[PDB]
Amino acid sequence: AKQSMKAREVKRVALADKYFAKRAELKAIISDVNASDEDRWNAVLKLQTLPRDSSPSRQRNRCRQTGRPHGFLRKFGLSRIKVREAAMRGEIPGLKKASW
């Protein structure tokens, strides 16, 4: 991928982890039905106050080694090409050709 794109991922994840404490304890008020609409509205408007890419939903899953949005495996953490290369070279334990 691009250097700017890769830096965007770390910049988003850092601010998402830093503000994770506020996001959960702020959406808790919204989720709590037993609350006043005056505090519900305040919580709703205060959540849009923090910077946008501060949520886990606003980040992608580019592969660590190279960087590729389309094509990824959560268990392996790399794109399809890199996963195949690692499997063929033996870097992934207990991974062989499936044939049933």
Binding site: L73, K75, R80, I81, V83, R84, A87, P93, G94, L95, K96, K97, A98, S99
Partner: protein, 99 residues
């Protein structure tokens, strides 16, 4: 009372581990119920190995995980000393359950 679970990618590294643990339990204690296997799990992956437009070049990869279980043979204090030893060769995950 206590049980030991072994997860392995290959059976070669887990059969010898089971043999070692049962011989240690025979040296310290007796009345073994034998290592019982559990249904292994096979996680599949489909990887299209073509780095561009070709939805015909696919590879099927498999991760196998085999489970072994060893129960109590003689619950005492000396039998735990010989089982809390250093970990075995890398590749075998050992879980200790007590109750």
């Amino acid at each position: 009372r206590i049980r030991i679970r072994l997860k392995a990618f290959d059976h070669r590294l887990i059969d010898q581990a089971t043999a070692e643990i049962v011989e240690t339990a025979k040296r310290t204690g007796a009345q073994v119920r034998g290592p019982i296997p559990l249904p292994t799990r096979k996680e599949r992956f489909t990887v299209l190995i073509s780095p561009h437009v070709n939805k015909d070049a696919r590879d099927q990869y498999e991760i196998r995980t085999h489970l072994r279980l060893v129960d109590i043979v003689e619950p005492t204090e000396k039998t735990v000393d010989a089982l809390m030893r250093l970990d075995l060769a890398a590749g075998v995950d050992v879980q200790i359950s007590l109750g």
